[PDB]
Design a protein around this ligand. Sequence first.
Ligand SMILES: C[N+](C)(C)CCO
Ligand SMILES: [Cl-]
Ligand SMILES: [Zn+2]
Length: 296
Amino acid sequence: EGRMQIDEQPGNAIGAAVEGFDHATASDADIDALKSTIYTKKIAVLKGQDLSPQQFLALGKRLGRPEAYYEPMYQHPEVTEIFVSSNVPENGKQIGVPKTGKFWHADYQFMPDPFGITLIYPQVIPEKNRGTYFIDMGRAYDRLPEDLKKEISGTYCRHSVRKYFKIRPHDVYRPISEIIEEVERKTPAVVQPTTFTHPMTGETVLYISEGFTVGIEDQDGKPLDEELLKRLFDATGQLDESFEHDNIHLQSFEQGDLLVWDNRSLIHRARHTTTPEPTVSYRVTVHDERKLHDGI
Ligand SMILES: C[N+](C)(C)CCO
Ligand SMILES: [Cl-]
Ligand SMILES: [Zn+2]
């Protein structure tokens, strides 16, 4: 320690900037303060980071236990634990996967044991159409009409990667039903409480996303009409294709920025592809000291 400085946005405004962060020398109290900032301000932007893939993973290890993405075509060639979103060929070759996350989601929401913190280290940044959209789903919950809160009290949601699973080079010439069935076998839909208590802040989080949440079920386990999910998506801002809804936060960044955010509370998505500008980003996803929620 001796130089890390966190500047939190005032009041209820989302976000914080962190200057002078060096993951190799930060103290234990520094890391604890940074983590408190992530859980309360939801997005911490580390400034002036110039890291190799190896150093990026080491930074993530300061915060928690990294997990490699379960489909290895997304993995960085040198560091299995880095997820690569890229549409810039490297010597003509495709590294990682292009056009990822073009839908509202929380990371690993379709898995039984989602990690609590996501780190994004942008490498190639669109000049004009840059940034990632975010919605804080605890704040979104609080802003729901009281009756809508009542309607989802006691319900459960099913989450699945089945809509957005990407065809892999190995899948060419396979019948489509075989892949559909493989996805159900490898990543069966996961049931979660529709709302859960955030272990670090105590706040109630509405844990749904247009991208991964495929059904809602009652406190007896019987499916409810998906019109309820549409009304929740609509109320929380996830159906607004203009991205002007009051819940929506556009997070921009510049070279050297490294975003760390609360993957319990937030959902995020890429912007519309309104320009041909490329994107390359490295992702590290870590488990912190608690499960997603205490029922996991
Ligand atoms: C990387 N995501 C899990 C967000 C989508 C890929 O299907
Ligand atoms: Cl994910
Ligand atoms: Zn994501």
